[PDB]
Design a protein around this ligand. Structure first.
Ligand SMILES: O=C([O-])/C(F)=C\c1ccc(O)cc1
Ligand SMILES: O=C([O-])/C(F)=C\c1ccc(O)cc1
Ligand SMILES: O=C([O-])/C(F)=C\c1ccc(O)cc1
Lengths: 61, 61, 61, 61, 61, 61
């Protein structure tokens, strides 16, 4: 299983390490996928490249 | 955050329900993100559309 | 530019035709890109493959 | 609806803001999707990471 | 490395087998990556879900 | 056909140019796709954003 986590910049390297651990475990225990088969990709987003309702987060409070 | 889980066809509806819940909790507890801001997408693959080492899974023997 | 619109199943063929046209015009008028260089991909999701707050849409009540 | 716009580096922050506005509007008026449900991601490409006909744009005139 | 080939429906099972093999060899010989570390995903598109210049392929005449 | 090659940072610009050439050729000769229709995107991954078996590559030897 390939897991892509897309989130905003701002997380610490420690939070990223924990995210990978926990997400990998969640997948392993709910899909029966072997541990060495679970891959996780982290993709960081910039506020000026992310919008909701036509307004970029960099343009909001 | 946005999480995309890409895995082979086969999981039951129940397993998918658990996958979504566990993965959401993993993200919430590890990044601080609030539940209503955590989106999960599930993408299923066919054994004849996934390959490793030049051999599609549907062609392994 | 390449635009991928990911949305739930349900739109009619007509709506998709309009989506492609309007989105292409939006890109052309806003980035300066020429029409023949604007590609649009449509990706449909199933309600049981999309979740928010740990609950797939097919499980909301 | 989730819209990912993948385009080359080179656009101004103003063009990006306009792109988001227009694209969000195009989606809203052709799919009946509510405004607060339309998300837009902008992904920028580097010329040396983009190719057509086997030739990267960074290797063209 | 992970290679995703996105193309229109239509190729035969044989062509896909060859695509996977050739693409894997191209990656191996050009990046130095070992075969067991080269994954290939095939994604098929529908003519009514792919557009260029504001016209879906299923609408071209 | 759209080919996305996702690999770790570390390759030379020459290896990237060769990758594009070879991959484009592999696709052309196995799918019957015209040369000017084959697009290749290179996406580089950071070791601290890539994990296998719950362990990020930046956390391995
Ligand atoms: O925080 C994240 O990582 C994120 F991907 C999205 C988000 C969207 C809307 C908000 O109000 C807050 C966060
Ligand atoms: O301009 C863009 O944003 C783009 F994504 C592609 C492109 C491709 C070929 C061209 O000749 C010009 C632009
Ligand atoms: O090398 C690459 O480009 C890559 F995408 C992955 C990888 C994964 C596991 C390894 O042990 C080595 C490389």
């Amino acid at each position: 299983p390939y897991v892509t986590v897309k989130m905003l910049e701002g997380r610490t390297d420690e939070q990223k390490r924990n995210l990978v651990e926990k997400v990998t475990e969640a997948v392993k225990e709910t899909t029966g996928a072997s541990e060495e088969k679970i891959v996780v990709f982290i993709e960081e987003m910039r506020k000026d490249h992310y919008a909701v309702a036509g307004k970029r987060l960099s343009d909001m409070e």
